[PDB]
C-alpha cells in the first residue's frame, strides 16, 4: 500500500503512527511494522487526525525506535482457519505454538466480526448433565446455555474447568473450543499433556478440540484481542461448519481488564473503577458473538476472575447481563471445605424452572433453598449463643441443612491426584433422588463425617458403615 | 416467545437497544419509546411502559459523555442524569377528559446495585416515583418467587388506585403484617412469649404464605 | 439442687455468650476499618476525575 | 460598538456560550432573549470568558439551535411580574401564566434575584403559630415569621402533612401564601391545585389568598433553580411594598438544593462533598436570608425538605439542619407503627419549647414526655432479650406510658380520605397541654394504649377510651 507512515510515537503497547499520506487506514484496520522483531501486527482504533492514528498493538512493544517504517495491511487480520485449526494450539497471530507448523487455510476470517442479530437468534432451554450434583439441581445446563463461573483467586477454576471438558465436551460433538486469555502457561501445559493423552487432541487422528492460548505475559493490547481471534475460531465452526460448538474462556476478566489498562492510554476516559467506558458495549459485542444461532448454537462457559471478589465491581455486573446460567464459586463456601466450592444460594439458570426440567426437582432444589437460607440466617444467633437456645424444630431444620451442606460435596475427578481423593460424578437422575430422601430426613441419622467429603448418597451410607468400624 | 404464547403480542410492542446496539442509540431509545406510548395516548388509547433497564441507560450516557468529554456528576454518570430522567418520566400520566383521557403509564426499573439505593441513579428515581417495590433476593431463596420486601415498598398514591372492593379487603391487611414483621424479629431474640404475640405470629404465618407468589400465574 | 443447676448454668451460658460476641465485634471491626479506607479511595477518586475532566 | 446580539458558539447541552460582538461588555447575572420559534429561549449569564464570550446555563431546551444566532440580553436578573394578579394566578419560570387566566402583573416586575435584608432589618418575632397539631404545637411548636422545616423521607404521608398544614395554618392565616413547587410532579401540581378550589383558597372569581408557581421536575435543572429566586420575590413584594404579611410555601427544597448541584457540575466548578455545589452554604443562605421578618412586614416560610434515603449527614440535608428554625423530623420506625403524624419526638425540635416562652407547664410537661420515650427505647433492647427479666414494676410503667404515648401521637389529617379517611382534629393549645399533663400523673393509666390512637384533645382521649370501655 501507499500508506506508509512512520512511528512517532510508543506510549506502552499503544503505539501512534504518523501516515506521509492522506490515504489512511479505517478503525478496526490492520498494520505491519516491519522491525527486527519481525512483522508486529497492530490495529488501529483511533485516528488522532492529520495523519497521525493511535493504535492497539496485538504484538507485543519493547525496542522499538522512534520513526520506524509502517505499511497498512488492512482490515481486521485474517487467521487461517479449517479443521486443522483443530489439534493446534496458536498465539495471537494464529501461528501454531504446539508447532505443528502452519494452519491448513480454507476460510481466513477477520478477527473482528459483528455480532449476530435479533433475527438470527434461535431459542434453546435443553437439559445437559454435568456430572456434577449440586450444578444438575440448581442449574442443569442446556445445549447453547452460557454459563459462567465467577471464581474467586485460584479457587480450582482450573480445576472446575477441567471437571467440565472431562465429562460435558466427552458428551458433545460438532466441535469444542478451549481459548484461555491470559492463561499461567504451567496450568496450560498440564490441559495441553492431558489433551493429547485423552486424545481430545488427538493428532494421528483429528482432534476434536482447537486450541488458542494466550499468555498472561502477553502485554495487555494482545490480550483483548486473543478474545477476538477465539470468537472467530468459534464463529467458523458455528457458522460456516454449523456446528454445534462448545466455548471455554479462563478468564474473561482478563478481557475487561486489558480494556481497563488501555483505556487511558486511548485517550479514553476510564469509567468506574477503572474499567473503560466502552466496558458495556465490549462485553456486549462479545457477548453477541458468543450468542447462540439457528445456524449453530454454542455453549459457553467463561470465567471470570473476580478481583478481590465483590461482584457489583463493573465487569461482574456486565457479565450477569449476557449468562442464562451462573454458577458464581465463592471463597466462603470454598472455605467452609465443601468441593466443589460452588455457592448453592448463588447459581441460577432459566432452565430450573417449573416441569421445564420437572416439577418435583423444582420443587425439590425450592426447599434446599428455604431450608439453607434459615440455617445462613441464624448463623449469628446459633454462635453467639447455641442451636439449642433456639427451638426444637428448628434444631432439626439446621441439623438436616448441616448434613446438606457436607452432602453437597463431591470431589473432583481431575483433581483427584491433587486433593488425593478420587473424584465422583453423580447424574442427575441420580441427584433428584438423594436430595428427596435428605429432605425427608431419611438419612439424617447417620454421621456427618460420613457426609462430608463424599459424592452419592449411597457413597455416604457405605461411610456410615465404614466409620461404625 | 412468552408473550406470543399468550397471545399478548397483539398488543405488546417491544422496543429494544441490545448490549450489542450503540451507547448513543441505548441512551436514545427509552426516550422513543416514550414517544410510541405518547401516540397511545394521543389516541386516547391507554398503555403502560416498562423500563427495564435505566440503570444501563445511565452506563450508556455516561460513556457518551466521557467520550465527549464533558464534566460528569458523581458516580461518573454524567450530571443531568436527573434531567434525562425526569423530562421522561412526566411523560407518562392519564390526561383529562379534554386531553382524550389516554393514559401512558410507566413502571420504571432499575436493578439494585446490593441494595444500595443510596447510588445517584436510584436516589434519583426514588424521587421522581409515586412508590418504591423494594424487591428481596433473600426471600427469592427463602422461596417466594416473585419475593418482595414491603416494609420498603410504598405507594404514595394510596387506594385510590386500588379497587375499591380490595380497599375494603386489605384495610387491616397492612397492619396484621406489621404486627407479624415486629413479632417475627423480637422472637428469633428467644424470648418467652405471651399469647397476645403469639396470635400476631400464628396468624402471621398464615398471611406470610397468602402473600406468596410463583413466577407466571397471574388471578 | 435442680435450681441450683438453673441459675448456675444462666451464669456460665451469659459468659460464654459474651466471648463470642467479642470475636464477632472484631470481625465486624475489621470489616468496617476497610469500609472506611475504601470509602476515602472512591472520595479521592472522585476528586481526582473532577479535575481531570 | 455593536447592537446587542451574541452569536451562539458552543451548545453543550444546556451550557451554551455566545459569543457578544467585540464593543459590548456584558454583566454577570443578565437574562438573555433569544427569540426561537420554541418561544423565547432565556439564558441566565453565569461566566464571562472573555472578549465577549459569554458562557451562559439554558433555562430550557437546547434543540434545533445554530452557532451563529443573534442574542439580545435584557441585561439583569429576569424580571418576574409582582401584584396582586399574580394572587390567583399559575406563573411558571419565566414569570408567564400557565394557568392561562391572561396577564400577570399589575403594574410592575421586579428582578428574579434580591438580597438578603440588612441585620437591623433581619430581626424577627418569638411568636407560636399554633396549628391544633398536638405533635407539633408541643413538640416542636411554629412560630410567626418562622422559617418551619418539615423534613422528612420520602412520601410517608409527607403530601398529606403539608395538606394538612395548608387547610390549617392557611385558613387560620392573616396574611397570604404563596405556593411554589420546585421539580414537583404534575400529578401533584394538579392535586394541589384541584385542592385549593376546593379550599377556594384559589378562587376563580375575584383574587385566591395565594398565588402560585407550579415549576416541575421535567424543566431542565437550570429553570429548576431559578424558581426559587422567583417565588421568593413575589413574597418580597407583598411583604415589602404592599407591606401585606405572606406565609411561603415551597416544596421540595431538596430539588433545589439538587438543581444547583447539576449546573455547578455541568458550568465546571470542581465539585465539592457528595456532589454538592461549592457555593452551597451561600446560596442556602442566600434562600434563606432574603425570607425574614422586616419592619415592612413578616413572610413564614414552611419549607419542605425531602431527606435523601434518611440521610441527613449528606451536605445537603446537614447544611439545611442549621438554616432552618422550626424543625420537624419524621422517622421511618414511627411511621411504621402506624402513628401518622410520623413525627419523632426526639428528632422534632423548634427553637420556641423552652421555659415560659411556651408556658413554663406546657415545657414540663414536654420534657416528662421526652424522658419516658427515650427510656422506652432504651428499654426495647432489654426487652428483645430479657423480656420482662430484669424489668421492674416501674419499666412495665414507664412501656405502657410510652406506648399509650407513642400513640398519642397519632391523629388524624382533614386530608386524609384515602389516606385514612378519617377527618383531622385541631386540639386546643390549652387542651394539649392539659391531655399530656393527665397522661404522665397516671390519671389515663387505667385507660388502653389504643384510646390515644388517632386522638386529639382531652375530650378525645376520653371519648376513646369510652368508645373501648363500652
Known amino acids: 500500500t501507499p500508506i506508509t507512515g512512520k512511528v512517532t510515537a510508543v506510549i506502552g503497547a499503544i503505539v501512534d503512527v504518523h501516515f506521509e499520506q492522506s490515504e489512511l487506514p479505517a478503525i478496526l484496520n490492520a498494520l505491519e511494522i516491519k522491525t527486527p522483531q519481525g512483522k508486529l501486527v497492530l490495529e488501529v482504533a483511533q485516528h488522532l487526525g492529520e495523519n497521525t492514528v493511535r493504535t492497539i498493538a496485538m504484538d507485543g512493544t519493547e525496542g522499538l525506535v522512534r520513526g520506524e517504517k509502517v505499511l497498512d495491511t488492512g482490515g481486521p487480520i485474517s487467521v487461517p482457519v479449517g479443521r486443522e485449526t483443530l489439534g493446534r494450539i496458536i498465539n495471537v497471530i494464529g501461528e501454531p505454538i504446539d508447532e505443528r507448523g502452519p494452519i491448513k487455510s480454507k476460510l481466513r476470517k477477520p478477527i473482528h466480526a459483528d455480532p449476530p442479530s435479533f433475527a438470527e437468534q434461535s431459542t434453546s432451554a435443553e437439559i445437559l448433565e454435568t456430572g456434577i450434583k449440586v450444578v444438575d439441581l440448581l442449574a442443569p445446563y442446556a445445549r447453547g446455555g452460557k454459563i459462567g463461573l465467577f471464581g474467586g483467586a485460584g479457587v480450582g477454576k482450573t480445576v472446575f474447568i477441567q471437571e467440565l471438558i472431562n465429562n460435558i465436551a466427552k458428551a458433545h460433538g460438532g466441535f469444542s473450543v478451549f481459548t484461555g486469555v491470559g492463561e499461567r502457561t504451567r496450568?496450560?501445559?498440564?490441559?495441553?499433556?492431558?489433551?493429547?493423552?485423552?486424545?481430545?487432541?488427538?493428532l494421528?487422528?483429528?482432534?476434536?478440540?482447537?486450541?488458542?492460548?494466550?499468555?498472561?505475559?502477553?502485554?495487555?493490547?494482545?490480550?483483548?484481542?486473543?478474545?477476538?481471534?477465539?470468537?472467530?475460531?468459534?464463529?467458523?465452526?458455528?457458522?460456516?461448519?454449523?456446528?454445534?460448538?462448545?466455548?471455554?474462556?479462563?478468564?474473561?476478566?482478563?478481557?475487561?481488564?486489558?480494556?481497563?489498562?488501555?483505556?487511558?492510554?486511548?485517550?479514553?476516559?476510564?469509567?468506574?473503577?477503572?474499567?473503560?467506558?466502552?466496558?458495556?458495549?465490549?462485553?456486549?459485542?462479545?457477548?453477541?458473538?458468543?450468542?447462540?444461532?439457528?445456524?449453530?448454537?454454542?455453549?459457553?462457559?467463561?470465567?471470570?476472575y473476580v478481583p478481590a471478589d465483590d461482584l457489583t465491581d463493573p465487569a461482574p455486573a456486565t457479565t450477569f447481563a449476557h449468562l442464562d446460567a451462573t454458577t458464581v464459586l465463592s471463597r466462603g463456601i470454598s472455605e467452609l471445605g465443601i468441593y466443589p466450592a460452588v455457592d448453592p444460594l448463588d447459581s441460577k439458570s432459566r432452565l430450573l424452572d417449573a416441569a421445564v426440567v420437572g416439577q418435583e426437582h423444582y420443587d425439590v432444589a425450592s426447599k434446599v433453598q428455604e431450608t439453607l437460607q434459615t440455617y445462613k440466617s441464624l448463623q449469628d444467633i446459633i454462635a453467639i449463643l447455641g442451636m439449642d437456645e433456639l427451638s426444637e424444630q428448628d434444631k432439626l431444620t439446621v441439623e438436616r441443612a448441616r448434613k446438606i451442606q457436607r452432602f453437597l460435596s463431591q470431589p473432583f475427578a481431575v483433581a483427584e491426584v491433587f486433593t488425593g481423593i478420587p473424584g465422583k460424578l453423580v447424574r442427575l437422575k441420580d441427584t433428584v433422588a438423594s436430595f428427596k430422601a435428605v429432605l425427608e430426613g431419611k438419612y439424617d441419622n447417620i454421621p456427618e463425617h460420613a457426609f462430608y467429603m463424599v459424592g452419592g448418597i449411597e457413597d455416604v451410607v457405605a461411610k456410615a458403615e465404614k466409620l461404625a468400624a | 416467545q412468552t408473550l406470543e404464547q399468550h397471545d399478548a403480542m397483539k398488543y405488546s410492542i417491544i422496543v429494544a437497544a441490545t448490549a450489542?446496539?450503540?451507547?448513543?442509540?441505548?441512551?436514545?431509545?427509552?426516550?422513543?419509546?416514550?414517544?410510541?406510548?405518547?401516540?397511545?395516548?394521543?389516541?386516547?388509547?391507554?398503555?403502560?411502559?416498562?423500563?427495564?433497564?435505566?440503570?444501563?441507560?445511565?452506563?450508556?450516557?455516561?460513556?457518551?459523555?466521557?467520550?465527549?468529554?464533558?464534566?460528569?456528576?458523581?458516580?461518573?454518570?454524567?450530571?443531568?442524569?436527573?434531567?434525562?430522567?425526569?423530562?421522561?418520566?412526566?411523560?407518562?400520566?392519564?390526561?383529562?377528559?379534554?386531553?382524550?383521557?389516554?393514559?401512558?403509564?410507566?413502571?420504571?426499573?432499575?436493578?439494585?446495585?446490593?441494595?444500595?439505593?443510596?447510588?445517584?441513579?436510584?436516589?434519583?428515581?426514588?424521587?421522581?416515583?409515586?412508590?418504591?417495590?423494594?424487591?428481596?433476593?433473600?426471600?427469592?431463596?427463602?422461596?417466594?418467587?416473585?419475593?418482595?420486601?414491603?416494609?420498603?415498598?410504598?405507594?404514595?398514591?394510596?387506594?385510590?388506585?386500588?379497587?375499591?372492593?380490595?380497599?375494603?379487603?386489605?384495610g387491616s391487611l397492612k397492619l396484621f403484617l406489621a404486627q407479624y414483621r415486629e413479632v417475627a424479629a423480637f422472637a428469633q431474640f428467644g424470648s418467652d412469649l405471651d399469647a397476645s404475640t403469639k396470635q400476631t405470629l400464628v396468624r402471621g404465618e398464615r398471611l406470610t404464605q397468602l402473600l406468596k407468589q410463583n413466577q407466571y400465574s397471574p388471578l | 439442687q435442680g435450681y441450683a443447676a438453673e441459675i448456675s448454668a444462666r451464669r456460665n451460658a451469659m459468659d460464654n455468650a459474651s466471648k463470642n460476641a467479642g470475636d464477632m465485634i472484631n470481625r465486624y471491626s475489621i470489616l468496617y476499618n476497610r469500609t472506611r479506607q475504601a470509602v476515602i479511595t472512591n472520595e479521592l477518586v472522585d476528586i481526582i476525575t473532577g479535575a481531570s475532566s
Open chain 1, 204 to 304: 494421528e487422528g483429528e482432534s476434536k478440540v482447537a486450541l488458542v492460548f494466550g499468555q498472561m505475559n502477553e502485554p495487555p493490547g494482545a490480550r483483548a484481542r486473543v478474545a477476538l481471534t477465539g470468537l472467530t475460531i468459534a464463529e467458523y465452526f458455528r457458522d460456516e461448519e454449523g456446528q454445534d460448538v462448545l466455548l471455554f474462556i479462563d478468564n474473561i476478566f482478563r478481557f475487561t481488564q486489558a480494556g481497563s489498562e488501555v483505556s487511558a492510554l486511548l485517550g479514553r476516559i476510564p469509567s468506574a473503577v477503572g474499567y473503560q467506558p466502552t466496558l458495556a458495549t465490549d462485553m456486549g459485542l462479545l457477548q453477541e458473538r458468543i450468542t447462540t444461532t439457528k445456524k449453530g448454537s454454542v455453549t459457553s462457559v467463561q470465567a471470570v
Open chain 2, 20 to 170: 450489542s446496539e450503540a451507547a448513543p442509540l441505548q441512551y436514545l431509545a427509552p426516550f422513543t419509546a416514550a414517544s410510541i406510548g405518547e401516540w397511545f395516548r394521543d389516541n386516547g388509547k391507554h398503555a403502560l411502559i416498562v423500563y427495564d433497564d435505566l440503570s444501563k441507560q445511565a452506563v450508556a450516557y455516561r460513556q457518551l459523555s466521557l467520550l465527549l468529554r464533558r464534566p460528569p456528576g458523581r458516580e461518573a454518570y454524567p450530571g443531568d442524569v436527573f434531567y434525562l430522567h425526569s423530562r421522561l418520566l412526566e411523560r407518562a400520566a392519564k390526561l383529562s377528559e379534554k386531553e382524550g383521557s389516554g393514559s401512558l403509564t410507566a413502571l420504571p426499573v432499575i436493578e439494585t446495585q446490593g441494595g444500595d439505593v443510596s447510588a445517584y441513579i436510584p436516589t434519583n428515581v426514588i424521587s421522581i416515583t409515586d412508590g418504591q417495590i423494594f424487591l428481596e433476593a433473600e426471600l427469592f431463596y427463602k422461596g417466594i418467587r416473585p419475593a418482595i420486601n414491603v416494609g420498603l415498598s410504598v405507594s404514595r398514591v394510596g387506594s385510590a388506585a386500588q379497587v375499591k372492593a380490595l380497599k375494603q379487603v386489605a
Open chain 1, 187 to 202: 496450568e496450560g501445559n498440564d490441559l495441553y499433556r492431558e489433551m493429547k493423552e485423552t486424545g481430545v487432541i488427538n
